[PDB]
C-alpha cells in the first residue's frame, strides 16, 4: 500500500494527523487520527490556533442535518452542527465517501497551538459517537459505501524553536508488511465501543507489579492514538513509577519530572538509557489462558524536547501519567509498534515497528505465547448508571 506509507505527520506530543478533503470543490484540512473516539469533526469557524477551517457554505455537496452535537473530554470540549459531505483521503484509498461531519463552531482546550491539525477523525465504534450511536462514524461509512476491507493499521514513528516533526502511516484497508518485523500477535477487542482490550500482567524490567489484574483495566484499557502518553490507573501509576524510580535512582530528578511537567537533561549524546527499565504489558491472547507481551523502551516513554535555554543538551519529558478513566495505550505505546485494527475479526494486532527508536542493547518487543493456568478474569465491569440504562437501542 505504498501510496499510504508516510501519510501522517505532526509535532511530537501534539497528535498525528492525516490530510483529508471535504466538500466540492475539495477543502483541504489536516485531521487528527484518533482511535479513542468516533466522530468526524472539523473546525468550521475562525480560531486563534487554526490557520483554516471548513466553510460549509462553499461546498455544493454539503447537506445540513439540522441537529447540533456536543462532546466534552477530560481535557477539551467542542460543539457544532451536524451535516454530511463528500470526504476523501488524498494519500489514502482512491475513493470518495459521503460521511457525517460535525462542523465545530466553538471549542475550549481542544485545538492545540502549533499542532497544525484542524479537526479529528474518530475511528472507534458507533457506541461512543455523539449525539448517539445512530450517527454513523467515518470508517463505517467508508466500508459500507466502498469495497475497502474492514480494517486499518497504524505505524506511529517517534522523534530549537519548534517541537520535533513526527511521521507515520495509516494503512486503510490492510496491512503493509514493510512496516514491521517479526510476528504479529492479536488481542481480542473486549467490546466494540472504544478499542478496549485486557491487560493481564505488567512487568517493569522483568519484575511483576503483582497487582490484582483488574487494577490494570480499571475502569477500562483502550488503544488511543489521539492520547500522547501511556496513562495508567492511579494505583498502577504509583507502583510503576516507584519501580522506575528505583531502577533509575542514581539520578535524582525533581518531583515535576515524574509528574510529567518538567524536562531533565544530559549532555548531548550521553543520556544513560540503560538506567531506565523496560516496561512490558501482557495482553490477553486469542486463545484462553494465553497472553503475549509488548515491551517498550525508555526511548518510547521519555519524550525528547529541545530546550531553547540549553540547546546543546538532550532533554526529556516523562510521558507516563496518572488516569482516572482507565489505562490508555497512547502514542507512547504505539510508537514501539505497528498496530492493526482488525475490526472484521474483532481484534488488535501488534508487531515490532520498523521505525521504532531503540539502541544497540535493547529493542521494543512483541513476544508470546505465555500461559497461565486457571486465569482470573481481568476485565472490570463499569457501574451501570440509570441514564445509560434508560437508552433504547433499536
Ligand atoms: O479519548 C478520547 O475521547 C473520549 C471520549 C469522550 C466522549 C465521547 C467519546 C469519546 C479522544 C479525544 C481526545 C484524545 N482521544 C481527548 O480525550 N481529549 C482530546 C483533546 C484534543 C484531541 C483529542 C482528544
Ligand atoms: Zn424504544
Curated annotation (Swiss-Prot):
<dbReference type="GO" id="GO:0140448">
    <property type="term" value="P:signaling receptor ligand precursor processing"/>
</dbReference>
<keyword id="KW-0564">Palmitate</keyword>
<keyword id="KW-1133">Transmembrane helix</keyword>
<keyword id="KW-0812">Transmembrane</keyword>
<feature type="modified residue" description="N6-acetyllysine">
    <location>
        <position position="235"/>
    </location>
</feature>
<feature type="domain" description="Peptidase A1">
    <location>
        <begin position="16"/>
        <end position="351"/>
    </location>
</feature>
<dbReference type="GO" id="GO:0019899">
    <property type="term" value="F:enzyme binding"/>
</dbReference>
<dbReference type="GO" id="GO:0098686">
    <property type="term" value="C:hippocampal mossy fiber to CA3 synapse"/>
</dbReference>
<dbReference type="GO" id="GO:1990000">
    <property type="term" value="P:amyloid fibril formation"/>
</dbReference>
<feature type="modified residue" description="N6-acetyllysine">
    <location>
        <position position="67"/>
    </location>
</feature>
<protein>
    <recommendedName>
        <fullName>Beta-secretase 1</fullName>
        <ecNumber>3.4.23.46</ecNumber>
    </recommendedName>
</protein>
<keyword id="KW-0458">Lysosome</keyword>
<dbReference type="GO" id="GO:0071280">
    <property type="term" value="P:cellular response to copper ion"/>
</dbReference>
<keyword id="KW-0007">Acetylation</keyword>
<dbReference type="GO" id="GO:0070931">
    <property type="term" value="C:Golgi-associated vesicle lumen"/>
</dbReference>
<keyword id="KW-1015">Disulfide bond</keyword>
<keyword id="KW-0967">Endosome</keyword>
<dbReference type="GO" id="GO:0034205">
    <property type="term" value="P:amyloid-beta formation"/>
</dbReference>
<feature type="glycosylation site" description="N-linked (GlcNAc...) asparagine">
    <location>
        <position position="289"/>
    </location>
</feature>
<keyword id="KW-0449">Lipoprotein</keyword>
<dbReference type="GO" id="GO:0010288">
    <property type="term" value="P:response to lead ion"/>
</dbReference>
<dbReference type="GO" id="GO:0005770">
    <property type="term" value="C:late endosome"/>
</dbReference>
<feature type="modified residue" description="N6-acetyllysine">
    <location>
        <position position="214"/>
    </location>
</feature>
<dbReference type="GO" id="GO:0030424">
    <property type="term" value="C:axon"/>
</dbReference>
<feature type="modified residue" description="N6-acetyllysine">
    <location>
        <position position="220"/>
    </location>
</feature>
<feature type="modified residue" description="N6-acetyllysine">
    <location>
        <position position="234"/>
    </location>
</feature>
<feature type="glycosylation site" description="N-linked (GlcNAc...) asparagine">
    <location>
        <position position="94"/>
    </location>
</feature>
<dbReference type="GO" id="GO:0045121">
    <property type="term" value="C:membrane raft"/>
</dbReference>
<dbReference type="GO" id="GO:0005768">
    <property type="term" value="C:endosome"/>
</dbReference>
<feature type="modified residue" description="N6-acetyllysine">
    <location>
        <position position="210"/>
    </location>
</feature>
<dbReference type="GO" id="GO:0043025">
    <property type="term" value="C:neuronal cell body"/>
</dbReference>
<keyword id="KW-0645">Protease</keyword>
<dbReference type="GO" id="GO:0008798">
    <property type="term" value="F:beta-aspartyl-peptidase activity"/>
</dbReference>
<dbReference type="GO" id="GO:0005794">
    <property type="term" value="C:Golgi apparatus"/>
</dbReference>
<dbReference type="GO" id="GO:0009986">
    <property type="term" value="C:cell surface"/>
</dbReference>
<dbReference type="GO" id="GO:0005802">
    <property type="term" value="C:trans-Golgi network"/>
</dbReference>
<dbReference type="GO" id="GO:0042987">
    <property type="term" value="P:amyloid precursor protein catabolic process"/>
</dbReference>
<keyword id="KW-0968">Cytoplasmic vesicle</keyword>
<dbReference type="GO" id="GO:0071287">
    <property type="term" value="P:cellular response to manganese ion"/>
</dbReference>
<comment type="subunit">
    <text>Monomer. Interacts with RTN1; RTN2; RTN3 and RTN4; the interaction leads to inhibition of amyloid precursor protein processing. Interacts with SNX6. Interacts with PCSK9. Interacts with NAT8 and NAT8B. Interacts with BIN1. Interacts (via extracellular domain) with ADAM10 (via extracellular domain). Interacts with SORL1; this interaction may affect binding with APP and hence reduce APP cleavage. Interacts with NRDC AND NRG1.</text>
</comment>
<feature type="modified residue" description="N6-acetyllysine">
    <location>
        <position position="242"/>
    </location>
</feature>
<dbReference type="GO" id="GO:0005764">
    <property type="term" value="C:lysosome"/>
</dbReference>
